[PDB]
């Protein structure tokens, strides 16, 4: 044991090099509100990581004739006039590598979790060009979010940008953490072509929220493959601005090496606010909602690196799940509409439904997965292809039913079917379901087998039926898993077991659901 302790320090001592080289040292002539002007540094690169003497760093944005304007990252309260500023010979870049798996790192890759340094393979520039049009292929394989609503109605495909969006306290981080946790079954396979690594970039979230998300991931074994880039609300605007870019860099290193990544950005609205701060402190004129004209460029530059590469570039992918905090369901505001224009579909989590008890509060009709359907296992597509329109129609019809004395028999049937399907989709927190379970549960409702069950008991009927199947006719689950199709033989078996159960199922009123 002591041998390794001595050997590591011995290697450090012997490897120490008297590196006497040439550093261009400049001097700060001004500093305030996260911006520092540095005269000198005649050979500085635009967006270079200048290193100020307090250990803090800065990104050189404006290279004027007199001086360099640097956005300071982190504790700018240490900066003062006259301090030496040293180059670092690296354009804005972050370390990347497999060592980041299971580490909470501030937006520059410096670990904050308290564990040791990170063995970075290399450094990646935060501003590398996204894959060109000819370097992609349409997303062709699913990313099972573990949520019946998302994986049935608006599926997320590997390489897709699915924008979770909704008011405060509406179940967004819950959906993202659930989709991170659900990937453990794939991670354990040990197959890079199927493993899904994760990166959770918290922008402006409270420290306690990041701690809770980390605990939720740890309890579900998700820290073996999940990185956290924490730019808490305490950090300055610079960290909140470039946290998504460092998360995207960590993810891109793996994406270009043939692996699959799931980048969550929580919230990109807090990145936009931090960039508004940086730009206005730089006196760049504001635009709509006081944002700079290039906020769209910020978010698109970010999310356009989330792609499904071609087989010629390793066939890797990076799925983005940006979270946008709307204000009072203003989906037409500036930042929401931007991120919708960049992303490939939105899951709108309505607050009225969240308070009403419908969790996750997926607002049907407004929610859609543009490049969905293609990335969805054939069983789920055959069983849930029509679910979104049916649920939206039920929502439209509920307003009429809320005031109608009586309705057409067809309208009554649709109202009932919707009132059972919405209860079926509802799901408890941190309780992801494998794809087989999701397809069976959605099959129960879409094919009408729930129509005999009272609404209030649907949750139990499904919840227990999956248990009944789970160890009485596991042939169904294994068939779905291996074949990924709901074969007619398996469908007949499934309806047989559903009826066998319904005979023995007792509702809350004591009535049989036969």
């Amino acid at each position: 044991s002591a041998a390794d302790i001595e050997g590591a320090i011995e290697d450090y001592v012997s490897s120490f090099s008297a590196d006497t080289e040439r550093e261009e040292i400049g001097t700060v002539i001004d500093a305030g509100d996260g911006i520092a002007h540095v005269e000198g540094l005649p050979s500085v690169m635009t967006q270079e990581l200048l290193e100020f003497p307090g250990g803090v760093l800065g990104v050189a944005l404006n290279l004027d004739e007199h001086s360099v304007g640097a956005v300071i990252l982190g504790e700018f309260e240490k900066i003062e006039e006259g301090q030496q500023v040293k180059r670092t010979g690296e354009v804005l870049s972050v370390p990347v590598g497999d060592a980041f798996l299971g580490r909470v790192v501030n937006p520059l890759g410096q670990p904050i979790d308290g564990q040791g340094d990170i063995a970075a393979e290399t450094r990646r520039a935060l501003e590398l060009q996204a894959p060109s049009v000819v370097q992609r292929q349409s997303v062709s394989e699913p990313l099972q979010t573990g949520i019946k609503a998302i994986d049935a109605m608006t599926p997320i495909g590997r390489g897709q940008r699915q924008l979770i969006i909704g008011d405060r306290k509406t179940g967004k981080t819950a959906v993202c953490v659930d989709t991170i946790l659900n990937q453990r079954e794939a991670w354990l396979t040990g197959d890079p072509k199927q493993q899904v690594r994760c990166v959770y970039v918290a922008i402006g979230q409270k420290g306690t929220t990041i701690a809770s998300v980390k605990r939720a991931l740890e309890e579900g074994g998700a820290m073996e493959y999940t990185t956290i880039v924490a730019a808490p609300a305490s950090d300055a605007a610079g960290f909140k601005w470039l946290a998504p870019y460092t998360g995207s860099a960590i993810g891109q290193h793996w994406m270009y090496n043939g692996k699959h990544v799931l980048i969550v950005f929580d919230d990109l609205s807090k990145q936009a606010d931090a960039y508004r701060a940086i730009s206005l402190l730089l006196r760049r004129p504001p635009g709509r909602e006081a944002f700079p004209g290039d906020v769209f460029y910020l978010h698109s530059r970010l999310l356009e690196r989330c792609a499904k590469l071609s087989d010629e570039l390793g066939g890797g992918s990076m799925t983005g799940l940006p979270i946008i905090e709307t204000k009072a369901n203003d989906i037409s505001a500036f930042i929401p509409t931007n991120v919708i224009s960049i992303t490939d579909g939105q899951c709108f989590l309505e607050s009225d439904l969240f308070n009403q008890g419908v969790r996750p509060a997926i607002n049907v009709g407004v929610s859609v997965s543009r490049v969905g359907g293609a990335a969805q296992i054939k069983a789920m597509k055959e069983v849930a292809g029509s679910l979104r329109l049916d649920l939206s129609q039920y929502r439209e019809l509920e307003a009429f039913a809320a005031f109608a004395s009586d309705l057409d028999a067809a309208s009554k049937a649709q109202l009932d079917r919707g009132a059972r399907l919405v209860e079926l989709l509802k799901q408890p927190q941190y309780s992801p379901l494998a794809v087989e379970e999701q397809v069976v549960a959605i099959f129960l409702g879409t094919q009408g087998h729930l129509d005999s069950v009272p609404v209030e008991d649907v949750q139990r009927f499904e919840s227990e039926l999956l248990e009944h199947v789970k160890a009485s006719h596991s042939d169904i689950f294994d068939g779905i898993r291996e074949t990924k199709k709901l074969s007619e033989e398996a469908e007949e078996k499934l309806v047989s077991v559903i009826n066998e159960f319904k005979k023995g199922f007792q509702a809350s009123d004591g009535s049989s659901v036969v």
Binding site: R283, P285, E289, A290, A328, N329, D330, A402, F403
Partner: protein
């Protein structure tokens, strides 16, 4: 009875319309403040 139901629906729709119009009014108020500040600070920046 139909009048009770119809006017309950009308009150609910009026409340929802009031909420939506208040949200729109608040957003327009914020937009007016932002635009006014933009004009003032643009004038300042040109001295």
């Amino acid at each position: 009875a139909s009048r009770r139901r119809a006017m309950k629906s009308a009150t609910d729709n009026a409340d929802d319309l009031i909420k939506a119009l208040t949200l729109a009014a608040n957003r327009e108020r914020q937009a007016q403040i932002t635009q006014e500040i933009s004009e003032i600070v643009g004038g300042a920046n040109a001295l």
